[PDB]
Write a protein that binds this DNA or RNA. Structure first.
Ligand code: CA
Ligand code: CA
Lengths: 152, 152
DNA sequence: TCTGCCTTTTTTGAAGGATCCTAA
DNA sequence: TTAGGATCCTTCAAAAAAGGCAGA
């Protein structure tokens, strides 16, 4: 558990509320127990000319990585434990994405029990739905109702 | 002056570096002495469903206003004196738009003596050029060299 | 099985301007 | 003339997903 300084988290929270994204997904997958799995991603996007800003963020957060997608680059953090540690410390300072971060934390904490009960899995999938509802969601396909249908 | 608190300025600088814009323009208009005027705008854009965020900004900055543009809204500050007071305080905390902020402050400081000679109006115009260079400029038309219709 | 990373796509929600109006 | 506001336009630079591979 890296501890992050407060002035860093305040500025970063403003920047995340603006250019960042807290993304929760349900992905069909026949080899997982309930034929789906959850993905949680913290992302900060920026034009590739300013990839230096994202490279410095990776140094400061101490985990995650930067990838180029031609025109733009993204800082990505997905690994569950460091994602939990990071969002736990950022969320107090968030204003537009606070609810999404707290949902992600709730999901992460219930993950252990999600993976042994289909109705607990479903409940967690409804929290994913709530995240997407708070985001500017436009291309989403798999929802908790997709999961419920498939569970037979 | 209105003296802003530190935690407000940290968060806002991150938000501004993300969704904000520090804009300097040279507008052609035959009724100004030099056939142009300088226009300086601090802008924060957000989707209109989140216009309450921008309304709150008016209250916290204590000047400026919010304009609905249909799909998105903008907080706008361009009145020269409060703009100068606000950017002076925000500038230290900016990381992507710090130079643009300092150019606007520099221009503002010279405006008075700008409206009193060619050569020095043109000089200020090159400082506008430099802010546009720092921005992701894509639709700019009137530059300092356009202003060389001051040539007679 | 489970997780984290890789690749790619969609559609804006921003950014960064240009131009027009009007009082004092 | 001037400052500040009002209307508008362009072109992305973001956001927010989708789908897939493979090592553990
Ligand atoms: Ca944004
Ligand atoms: Ca941005």
């Amino acid at each position: 558990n890296t501890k992050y300084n407060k002035e860093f988290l305040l500025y970063l929270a403003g920047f995340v509320d603006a250019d960042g994204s807290i993304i929760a997904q349900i992905e069909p997958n026949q080899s997982s127990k309930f034929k789906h799995r959850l993905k949680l991603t913290f992302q900060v996007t920026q034009k590739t000319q300013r990839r230096w800003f994202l490279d410095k963020l990776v140094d400061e957060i101490g985990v995650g990585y930067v990838r180029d997608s031609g025109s733009v680059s993204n800082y990505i953090l997905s690994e569950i434990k460091p994602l939990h540690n990071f969002l736990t410390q950022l969320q107090p300072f968030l204003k537009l994405k606070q609810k999404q971060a707290n949902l992600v934390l709730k999901i992460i904490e219930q993950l252990p029990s999600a993976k042994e009960s289909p109705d607990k899995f479903l409940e967690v999938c409804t929290w994913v739905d709530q995240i997407a509802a708070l985001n500017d969601s436009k291309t989403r396909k798999t929802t908790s109702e997709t999961v419920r249908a498939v569970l037979d």
